[PDB]
Structures are given as C-alpha cells and as structure tokens.
Amino acid sequence: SMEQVAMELRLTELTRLLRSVLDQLQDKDPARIFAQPVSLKEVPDYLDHIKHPMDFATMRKRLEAQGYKNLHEFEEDFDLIIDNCMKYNARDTVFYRAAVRLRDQGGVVLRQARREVDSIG
C-alpha cells in the first residue's frame, strides 16, 4: 500500500536521525570503552552479573536493520550501556567514570533529539 510505504519512509528518516544521534553519543566515548561487547572470553562471569549486555556496535547493527521503532527504544539501549557499566564496575574505576561522563554529555544530545523527533513527527 501507499500507507505502508509512507510508514517505511518515516522509519527510514527516523533511522537517519538516530544514526546521527548515535554518532554524536559515540564521540563522547573517545576511549572506546563502550564500542564493543564486553568479551565473555576475558570476563567469563559477566552474564552472571549483567543480564542484558549492550554496546555501541550492537546498537549500530540494530539501527541499520531499522530495528528502532521510536527514540524511546534507542534510549533504552543507550541507558543499558551506562547502567550495566555502573553496576559491574566500582565507583573508583576508569570504566565507571567513563559511563558517568557519557551519561552527562549524552543528555544534551538526547534532549534535542527528542524535540526533533516530536517536531518532525
């Protein structure tokens, strides 16, 4: 149908906007601490601690399959990155501190993304 196509154009454009959001969030992680999945070869107990692992490469795979229906779903995954790190790692670690800084800096980007998603529909 023409409506299914219109819907698919909206999703594609949402995907375009989320790709730009993802790039901007990932720049706030210059150390690449959150770039890839935590390695289960190197942290064999990880899944005993963290039930829903997340990382920027895994988000990008979902993104490019147009697997985010709305900004809320994308933000859920970003929040998993931060929240998993802040539980697994102690306060006095470079990892925890990197998560705090990503959360704080990403806030600004996500604030304007929400306005853009509502504004453009």
Side-chain angles (χ1 to χ4, degrees), residues 42-60 62-68 70-73:
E42 305 170 359
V43 188
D45 74 348
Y46 188 65
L47 300 180
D48 291 350
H49 294 269
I50 297 298
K51 300 297 177 189
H52 296 98
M54 195 42 58
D55 67 271
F56 288 131
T58 304
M59 293 190 60
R60 198 173 292 282
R62 188 164 160 192
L63 182 61
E64 291 309 336
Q66 302 188 343
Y68 295 114
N70 55 54
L71 184 57
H72 180 78
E73 293 186 342

Side-chain angles (χ1 to χ4, degrees), residues 4-6 8 11-15 17-40 42-60 62-68 70-110 112-118:
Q4 288 304 315
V5 172
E8 293 162 352
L11 181 61
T12 293
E13 282 309 298
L14 173 69
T15 304
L17 181 158
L18 296 181
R19 189 183 298 114
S20 173
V21 175
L22 185 62
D23 294 341
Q24 286 180 73
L25 295 176
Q26 192 155 22
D27 291 332
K28 309 311 182 161
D29 174 32
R32 302 191 69 83
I33 290 166
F34 307 102
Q36 292 294 329
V38 171
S39 175
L40 306 175
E42 305 170 359
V43 188
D45 74 348
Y46 188 65
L47 300 180
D48 291 350
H49 294 269
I50 297 298
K51 300 297 177 189
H52 296 98
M54 195 42 58
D55 67 271
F56 288 131
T58 304
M59 293 190 60
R60 198 173 292 282
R62 188 164 160 192
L63 182 61
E64 291 309 336
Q66 302 188 343
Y68 295 114
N70 55 54
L71 184 57
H72 180 78
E73 293 186 342
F74 178 98
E75 290 173 310
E76 292 198 327
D77 272 357
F78 180 62
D79 285 338
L80 276 178
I81 295 176
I82 296 310
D83 289 341
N84 288 346
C85 185
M86 293 176 75
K87 292 168 191 61
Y88 190 81
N89 303 108
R91 211 154 39 249
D92 73 330
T93 62
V94 63
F95 311 106
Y96 184 110
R97 288 159 175 286
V100 167
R101 289 163 62 80
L102 180 58
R103 192 196 57 183
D104 286 350
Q105 298 196 274
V108 185
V109 174
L110 290 172
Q112 203 56 40
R114 159 58 61 205
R115 297 196 60 88
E116 283 177 340
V117 165
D118 295 2

